[PDB]
């Protein structure tokens, strides 16, 4: 019975671990979105400059 108790508690801890890891991955996705938007803005600015010259 105590083994089953400990395994249930462990199952709760691993579920919390999974939720935390997924939240950290979502934050990484947001960071990547910020950096991608910055790079895309610089690319569009360079293309507009070249288009003006041509």
The footprint of a copy of itself (CB under 8 A) covers: 19-20, 22-23, 25-26, 28-29
Q: Is the CB of 19 or the CB of 40 nearer to a copy of itself?
A: 19
Q: 10 Å Cβ neighbour count for 4?
A: 8
d(CA 17, CA 30): 20
Q: Which two tokens stand for residue 6?
A: 């400990």
- Shortest distance (Å) from residue 36 CB to a copy of itself: 12
Q: Is the CB of 32 or the CB of 48 nearer to a copy of itself?
A: 32
- Shortest distance (Å) from residue 18 CB to a copy of itself: 8
Compute the residue count for the chain.
Answer: 54
């Amino acid at each position: 019975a105590g083994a089953r108790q400990a395994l249930k508690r462990r199952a709760v801890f691993m579920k919390r671990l999974n939720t935390v890891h997924n939240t950290a991955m979502n934050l990484q996705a947001q960071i990547d979105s910020i950096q991608t938007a910055t790079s895309t803005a610089e690319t569009v600015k360079a293309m507009e400059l070249g288009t003006k010259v041509v």
